[PDB]
Amino acid sequence: RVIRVGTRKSQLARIQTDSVVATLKASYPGLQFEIIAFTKELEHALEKNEVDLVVHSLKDLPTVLPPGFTIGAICKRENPHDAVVFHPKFVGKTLETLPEKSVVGTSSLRRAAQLQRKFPHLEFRSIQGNLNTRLRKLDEQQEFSAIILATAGLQRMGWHNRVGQILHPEECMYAVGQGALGVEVRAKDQDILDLVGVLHDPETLLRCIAERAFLRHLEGGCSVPVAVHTAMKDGQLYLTGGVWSLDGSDSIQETMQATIHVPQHEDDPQLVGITARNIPRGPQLAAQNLGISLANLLLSKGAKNILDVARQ
Numbered sequence: 001r002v003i004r005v006g007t008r009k010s011q012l013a014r015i016q017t018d019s020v021v022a023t024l025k026a027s028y029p030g031l032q033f034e035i036i037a038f039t040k041e042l043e044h045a046l047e048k049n050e051v052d053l054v055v056h057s058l059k060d061l062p063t064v065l066p067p068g069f070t071i072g073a074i075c076k077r078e079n080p081h082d083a084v085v086f087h088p089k090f091v092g093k094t095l096e097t098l099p100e101k102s103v104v105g106t107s108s109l110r111r112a113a114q115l116q117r118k119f120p121h122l123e124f125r126s127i128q129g130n131l132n133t134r135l136r137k138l139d140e141q142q143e144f145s146a147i148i149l150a151t152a153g154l155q156r157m158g159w160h161n162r163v164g165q166i167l168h169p170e171e172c173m174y175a176v177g178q179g180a181l182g183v184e185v186r187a188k189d190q191d192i193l194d195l196v197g198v199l200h201d202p203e204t205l206l207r208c209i210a211e212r213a214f215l216r217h218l219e220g221g222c223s224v225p226v227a228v229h230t231a232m233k234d235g236q237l238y239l240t241g242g243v244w245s246l247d248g249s250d251s252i253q254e255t256m257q258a259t260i261h262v263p264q265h266e267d268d269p270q271l272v273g274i275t276a277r278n279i280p281r282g283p284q285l286a287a288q289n290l291g292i293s294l295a296n297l298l299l300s301k302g303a304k305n306i307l308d309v310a311r312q
């Protein structure tokens with residue numbers, strides 16, 4: 001029963017999947033693997049029993065996975081922050097010291113809404129194409145003075161050098177599960193679920209449960225004006241959540257916390273699409289409540305309206 005690992009053809013995808021397989025081979029020295037190169041296709045490959053596990057970016061996974069599927073692992077989180085990559089002429093500058101009316105590229109409502117609010121005198125225009133395509137556009141064509149990208153993506157590509165500015169939460173908060181990898185497996189597949197569990201990082205898991213619960217209870221998806229920020233320090237788990245109108249004019253930003261001691265290891269159902277029976281459920285549950293609490297606190301202040309309008 002050799003471990004078949006489904007992956008997209010794109011360079012970044014294949015890199016991410018490799019780092020996972022690499023970590024599985026560290027815990028299971030001899031264990032044999034096999035890599036097999038609009039992500040529903042891979043999901044269909046899980047159903048056809050062609051593939052055994054697929055590696056996703058957490059933020060690209062629905063808060064509710066299709067019946068039969070589950071997230072078997074939340075890997076250690078990389079850098080969650082958003083980053084700015086400047087045009088060569090503006091190298092050395094910050095969004096804060098850019099010429100007024102400078103066009104910054106981004107096809108992210110979350111990023112756009114937040115940055116129009118903190119940088120009113122900068123124009124935020126959408127930009128399309130993979131991470132490389134956008135870099136061709138930023139450099140060659142004369143339109144964008146800068147672009148916005150996830151720090152974690154540049155780091156995996158080895159484009160760390162191109163990072164011009166690491167955006168703080170007080171300027172732009174990250175998408176839920178940004179910078180963290182999720183391993184998607186069949187829920188009725190206890191064997192794979194057992195192996196893959198080594199990949200669970202406790203802190204990251206609790207944090208991404210808070211973030212996904214929160215997003216889930218706002219009935220939000222991948223492309224909605226919703227950002228978060230989580231941190232664990234001395235027993236406490238901190239959650240900060242916010243919503244914005246497409247233009248970031250009206251906003252709601254709140255923070256709640258839960259006393260959740262960060263766990264050691266070990267039939268209950270998954271949480272926000274995540275199976276993790278190998279780590280204590282008390283904290284997982286407790287982190288979910290955090291999401292729910294904050295989500296309700298934002299709804300109590302008309303978050304739903306802001307979101308319904310945001311939907312074009």
Ligand SMILES: Cc1[nH]c(Cc2[nH]cc(CCC(=O)O)c2CC(=O)O)c(CCC(=O)O)c1CC(=O)O
Nearest residue numbers: 057059106107108110149150152153175178179222
């Ligand atoms: C949900 C999601 N997925 C991706 C696209 C995506 N998905 C995963 C990564 C890399 C980091 C990661 O894997 O967490 C990226 C690229 C990026 O965020 O710069 C974007 C950004 C699209 C854009 O650039 O306008 C968003 C929206 C958001 O984050 O608010």
